């Protein structure tokens, strides 16, 4: 499921330089880059079943925060309620 | 101490074991409450030496993993003015890991500057 | 030791490698349970030297980012009285960051002040 | 070591660079599960010297801000008995901040006390 | 080295600056899952010396305020067997605070004990 | 210093007390935001020596228990290029616990590399 | 250095002040995701010495109270192979509390083992 989010973010966002796993990138990675941390799975009743939490941590080169606001809006638009297909797991 | 002796000593000891580098300076300037960066490069012949025995700190969290050691010093002549600051940084791509000038001790004699003693991190 | 010997030594040491300085003193005085600051300025010829091989600390937070280091000492003659407290400060503009007189060791001989040994933070 | 040599050495060392002092001794006595303080003063000619290189700690909080350094030592003769304790304190007013006796090492020779070797904080 | 040399050396060192003490020994013994304390006393002529430069720590917690320093050492002959343990404690008192034997190093030569070299904590 | 002297010294020092060893290198390469491990082995004649007096530190958690120590160091000739990095590791099977190359100090003379000084952990 | 010289030196050093010892070895072996302990006992003539100056750290919890200290080293000949590990332990009963072999430094010359330098923790 990491692969689906990473592929979607890379495909749809062009300012993005790369999307990595939690502790992958080194200090010479080119910014802005995103990190896809996977959270808990909790049982949330019969209607929702197990709900998973995800975080897409954006990172930016400390020029100014306005670029980070723009990139946050881009990520939210890309992922919010848009169905994503994970080719690796085929689900 | 006459200044010319200090200049001759620094130039000699740099020339005993010199290394060419390309220090790239990224100076942050305040603009509307945020930083605007201007990247510049400079070249200097410089000697690199051990100044401390220390262990390699490793930092690893969701932002990324990087390990740095704070052992290597640096000694550069007066040919170029250097300033490292909370907002300014100086680094150069030495093989065996990026180098980063943490601090600059300016070797001054009678108010005239004739070289910098300097400290580095080898950000692996 | 005689007072005159110490005076000659300190004046000579300052004069080997002197630097003109403009220490700016900001003294806080209690007024109705709060501080009223009176800014005053003084000038002294001073020698600056390395006393410690310390490491640069960086303190970044939402209030701001500043990096200081405790390397540089300082030596000044008896010409001007200096005092540094929790409520008093003495700083000056060195071209490579502002220095700040953390502590003052007064060189006294037989109860007669003859000069101050001093320690600095070079606040980048 | 004969004791008289130690006495002569301590008195002579104090007399190279003596300073008159007024130790204000405040002793807490347990009364009904609480303290009752009896303040007493004593005067001693004393030599003050650097014994450590240390950095000024600064404790700032809603109770107040005070800075201390644990650098200066102290050497006082046998003329007066001193005792610093968890309940007992010995301060005195030096011009360069209040001076507080942290610890007392008594110089004993063959079971006879010949003088106190001491340590101070310079509270300011 | 031969044992008699340590014998003579330790006895001479103690007799140069001896001090009589009464080391009170409180030994805890397990009884039904809890301690039963046996208190005994012993007297030894012993020499007390500085072995470290340290700063007086202060607890001052809700239990109470005791301040201790880990400076003074101790050198006692072989006349009495000593054992300090997590359950056993050896303490005495000079006028300048109670003194607690934190640790004992037994000076052994060829498997024969010939005196204890020791460490103290002056609990003010 | 001429490079020939340094090379002769390093080869001699290695040959006083050499140890054939098989350093195994696992290099992580970034692939689609994750790592791919390329494992390859190398052999070098090497001298191992003590460089620090440090105490063994144990790390026990629900993940597992291992104890490491930073005492030992390494000296190796120029015959093979070594790089240790945040993403790269070099280890070998010493009989007294597995051993890992924390850091590599390359011995460079006149910009030419003629051996590595190096530091290890003995991962018991 | 020649191997025979090191062997003679270690044997002599042990024989200056030897102490008979019964090391008890508890080796944990993984079985079905847990440990099995195989207690095995060995004897070695050994010299014990002070390698560090340290203070007896004490650890009291609801599990129990024990106080340990790391001062004592140890030197043993080549007669028996020793291995301390995260899963293996070596301890012996000295009269002044138990002593646990924290770490083993094997003295090797040209790949030939000729004794261990060792560090102990005297557990009271």
UniProtKB/TrEMBL annotation, chain A:
Protein name, entry field: Uncharacterized protein
Annotated source species: Clostridioides difficile
Lineage: Bacteria, Bacillati, Bacillota, Clostridia, Peptostreptococcales
From TrEMBL, chains B, C, D, E, F, G:
Domain of life: Bacteria
Entry protein name: Uncharacterized protein
Organism: Clostridioides difficile
């Amino acid at each position: 499921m990491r692969a689906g989010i990473r592929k979607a973010l890379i495909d749809n966002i062009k300012e993005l330089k790369g999307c990595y796993e939690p502790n992958v990138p080194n200090k010479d990675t080119k910014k802005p880059y995103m990190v896809v941390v996977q959270g808990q799975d909790n049982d949330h009743g019969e209607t929702i079943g197990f709900e998973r939490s995800i975080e897409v941590w954006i990172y930016e080169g400390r020029t100014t925060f306005k670029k980070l606001d723009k990139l946050t809006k881009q990520v939210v638009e890309v992922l919010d309620m848009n169905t994503i297909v994970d080719e690796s797991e085929n689900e | 101490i006459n200044i010319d002796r200090r200049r001759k000593d620094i130039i000699r000891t740099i020339n005993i074991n010199p290394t060419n580098i390309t220090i790239t300076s990224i100076k942050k300037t305040e603009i509307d409450g945020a930083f605007e960066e201007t990247e510049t490069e400079i070249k200097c012949v410089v000697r690199i030496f051990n100044e401390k025995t220390a262990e390699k700190q490793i930092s690893s969290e969701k932002q990324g993993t990087f390990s740095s050691i704070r052992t290597y010093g640096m000694l550069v002549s007066n040919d170029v003015i250097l300033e490292v600051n909370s907002r300014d940084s100086l680094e150069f791509e030495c093989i065996y890991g990026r180098m980063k000038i943490v601090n600059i001790y300016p070797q001054i004699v009678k108010g005239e500057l004739c070289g910098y003693q300097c400290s580095l991190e080898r950000i692996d």
